[PDB]
């Protein structure tokens, strides 16, 4: 009685599930071959990024022992990147399998203490990247909830956009890196909030008369603005 | 030719992906949904109404608010069944054995 007879058609018919499998098993069904994803992009640890940090390009220090070999983003990518899907793009900035910095705690109170001091969340440390489908499902659910909350809101799609950007930037595992990308949309939402309040409650100001040199040149047009 | 998509363009990549031989419905990609809160919400609402766990589990139903069904499954029914018959008989359409039915389906769906 053999185990899993009908379960490896990829093996029976020489079908590769990915170019890495194609290269390994020598099926040679990928016309364009395979450029292997190196190990420093397949795995690694979280690092510091800013140049105004002294430990830049250095691994993050934790209370627990952790491999200090860092994930290296793709800084010099090839011109032709035949697969431009999210699956292949995310590997240039994050590892698909998550970082190699996760702890295995000898006790529950160490876990408790790390959480209490802000140094551990399983959301962050025991987790993979999110797939495009998962991200899209989350974004559409969030959009539905917001539309139900209020349809007649002008900051709606801006909130939805910051959510989308956070999800795409993987803020569960790199929240500081994702917030660095998404705070612009947060600022825009902050602006839209006031822009809506001042339209609801009629707020205006006495504008001064027109300046003598509003136009720089007489033949120039003075385009009228509301 | 296929150039790198920076991280700032990924939100646009999710809803306007590049062309493939197997594309999704980009117009329906904002309509794909799958609620992880469906059954928890159902249980919470029923237990708040006052039912028991057994009553809640008997009254539970799976979410209808999921991604809509392909209309081709209702419009090209007979053509698809015939294509599947051809595939089952001819080993998945090896060396172009279901091209007749597949081409009829493609023309019907595409119209030039």
């Amino acid at each position: 009685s053999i185990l899993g007879a009908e379960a490896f058609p990829e093996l029976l018919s020489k079908v590769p599930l990915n170019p890495q499998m194609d290269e390994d098993k020598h099926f040679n069904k990928y016309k364009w071959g395979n450029e292997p994803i190196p190990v420093n992009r397949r795995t690694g640890s979280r690092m510091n990024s800013s140049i105004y940090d002294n430990r830049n390009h250095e691994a993050v220090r934790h209370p627990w022992s952790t491999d200090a070999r860092t994930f290296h983003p793709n800084d010099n990518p090839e011109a032709d990147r035949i697969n431009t899907q999210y699956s292949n793009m995310v590997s240039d900035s994050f590892p698909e399998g998550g970082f190699s910095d996760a702890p295995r705690f000898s006790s529950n109170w160490e876990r408790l203490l790390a959480y209490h001091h802000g140094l551990y969340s399983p959301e962050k440390f025991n987790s993979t990247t999110k797939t495009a489908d998962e991200i899209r499902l989350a974004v559409n659910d969030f959009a539905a909830k917001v539309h139900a909350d209020d349809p007649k809101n002008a900051c709606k799609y801006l909130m939805i956009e910051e959510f989308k950007c956070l999800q795409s930037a993987q803020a569960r595992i790199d929240p500081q890196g994702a917030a660095t990308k998404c705070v612009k949309w947060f600022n825009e939402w902050r602006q839209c909030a006031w822009d809506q309040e001042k339209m609801v409650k009629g707020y205006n100001y006495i504008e001064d008369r027109r300046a003598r040199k509003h136009k720089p040149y007489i033949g120039a047009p003075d385009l009228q603005y509301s | 030719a296929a150039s790198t998509i920076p991280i700032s363009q990924w939100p646009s990549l999710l809803y306007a992906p590049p062309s493939s031989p197997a594309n999704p419905a980009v117009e329906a990609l904002p309509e794909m949904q799958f609620d992880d809160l469906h059954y928890p919400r159902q249980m919470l609402l029923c237990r708040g109404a006052g039912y028991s766990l057994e009553q809640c589990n008997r009254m539970a139903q799976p979410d209808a608010r999921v991604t809509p069904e392909n209309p081709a499954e209702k419009l090209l029914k007979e053509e698809a069944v015939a294509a599947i018959a051809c595939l089952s008989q001819r080993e998945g359409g090896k060396d172009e054995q279901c091209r007749y039915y597949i081409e009829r389906m493609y023309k019907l769906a595409n119209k030039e």
Binding site: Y157, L158, I160, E161 | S12, Y15, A16, P30
Partner: peptide
């Protein structure tokens, strides 16, 4: 579609 997918 959303208004921010427009860029041009």
């Amino acid at each position: 579609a959303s208004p921010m997918l427009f860029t041009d």
